[PDB]
Write a protein that binds this DNA or RNA. Sequence first.
DNA 1: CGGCATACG
DNA 2: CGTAG
DNA 3: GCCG
Length: 328
Amino acid sequence: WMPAYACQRPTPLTHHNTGLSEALEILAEAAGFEGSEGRLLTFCRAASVLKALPSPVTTLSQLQGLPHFGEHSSRVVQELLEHGVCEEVERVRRSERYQTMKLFTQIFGVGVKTADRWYREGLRTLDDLREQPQKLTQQQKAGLQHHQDLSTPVLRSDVDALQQVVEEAVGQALPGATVTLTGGFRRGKLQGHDVDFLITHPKEGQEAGLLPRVMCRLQDQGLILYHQHAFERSFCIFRLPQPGSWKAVRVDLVVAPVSQFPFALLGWTGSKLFQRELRRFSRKEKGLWLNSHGLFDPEQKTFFQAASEEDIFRHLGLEYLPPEQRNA
DNA sequence: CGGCATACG
DNA sequence: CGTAG
DNA sequence: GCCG
Ligand SMILES: [Cl-]
Ligand SMILES: [Mg+2]
Ligand SMILES: [Mg+2]
Ligand code: NA
């Protein structure tokens, strides 16, 4: 009675198998660092299955019949249950390759392919990167300059303050436009790496051209430490007040027309695995194509209208899950 | 075996 | 190539 | 790495 797709089952933020899921997610991350997207997906899916269980796994027996647990993931769990550590996981953790790829990929502007190239060139530390800055993109220069602040968690107190300043700019840019908190905070997280906001307007079409107007106003208020600048997604670094000072915070701003707002809200609320699984479910089980703009029936060549996330779950024949249960 | 989500900057 | 969930 |  464990469904195979993560979007078919509630996954709360906190659960009963934290240590086991964390170990599998190390292997998933390492698989991604080597370009093994299929193995990354299986380890992520197996980890997420454990997050959805109603109690702790105490015996290997309890994995039988669970989807995404075969010989490899079962052996990892068996060793953690019997010995408290998995040798494979500890070897990954200790490896120079894992540690450096993790360090490099957590820089804003650096992905797996860039990190891997730097690794092969012999680079290992952030100061190694700062010693050859003409090699860096301006986005990477920003990510490196701000790396320390961006490594500090954002608190829910921080979010409320940023939401207020974003609403002020949005209101001047387009009266009546609204700002909705999305991402991990909408799933109930008390901390985050960034803050995600979704912007729309109740009159279809009025949101066209909005984001440049919003960003120009935030920049004029001195709040933008970095951004890339027609566009509809902005990946920014904001100045957030602190006692006697301030800190840099990643903020994403997205604009959607109100007709697409439920699809954008669903996508930007995540989790990442939940959205991948939902889109896979849509296509492979229902023959419908889902993204953050809409839901397409490729046979009738028609888009589904949705007025709510509830509509979208119903369209897909899935029982509704609130954001707090999408923590796959 | 093929498949593994699907966009925008 | 990077970014997003 | 696992599923269908
Ligand atoms: Cl793979
Ligand atoms: Mg976020
Ligand atoms: Mg984000
Ligand atoms: Na990065």
